Structure 1
């Protein structure tokens, strides 16, 4: 059986481990981060990724590193990219032997 990647959107972790944990609505989070409510709404709906600026805001608000959020984002972006082009990439790139 071959390896695979299944995507987990960062907004799912935001919803489950932060918004639901502290009983914060997405709109209340947007007001606290000083961003537009659709900005947070898009993320929790899994319709937008975490930008660097947003990662710094979330880290500041929730006492995390900004990299925590960017690492969740990179995993999601890698999973979607892998499911789309990963098999072809592995088919056409011969690993370096040196």
Structure 2
């Protein structure tokens, strides 16, 4: 999968923090999460979960689904490497 148009969830969050002039620990405090948890989220060492999507919607903005959409692109790219659809065919009315 070409990721050219699929930004890293963590990068988008960091980009937002840069525009707001907010530090990692201030972001962590605002999200009521530990600094370590915030770091993993920003660096991508931890996937953006539904729980995090809800918190991000409040603290940063946009909707929980928007944040999950960002993560789905990468989760889909990973799954693609392990899923075999080479023999699958679209079902038609029987």
Q: Compute the TM-score of the two structures, normalised by the length of structure 2.
A: 0.84
2:13 corresponds to which residue?
Answer: 14
- Displacement of 1:5 after TM fit? 3.3
Secondary structure class of the residue paired with 1:60: helix
1:85 corresponds to which residue?
Answer: 82
State how far apart, in whole Å, the 1-side matches of 2:18 and 2:32 are. 20
What's the CA shift string for 1:1-29, capped at 9, x where partnerless?
xxx3326421011112x111111122210
**Alignment partner of 1:37 out of 28, 35, 49:** 35
Which consecutive aligned stretches of 4+ in structure 1 deviate over 6 angstroms post-superposition?
A: none
Structure 1 gap ranges (5+): none
What's the CA shift string for 1:40-67, capped at 9, x where partnerless?
1001111111111111111011232111
RMSD: 1.6
Q: Compute the TM-score of the two structures, normalised by the length of structure 1.
A: 0.81
Structure with the greater relative contact order (CA < 8 A, sep ≥ 6): 1 or 2?
1
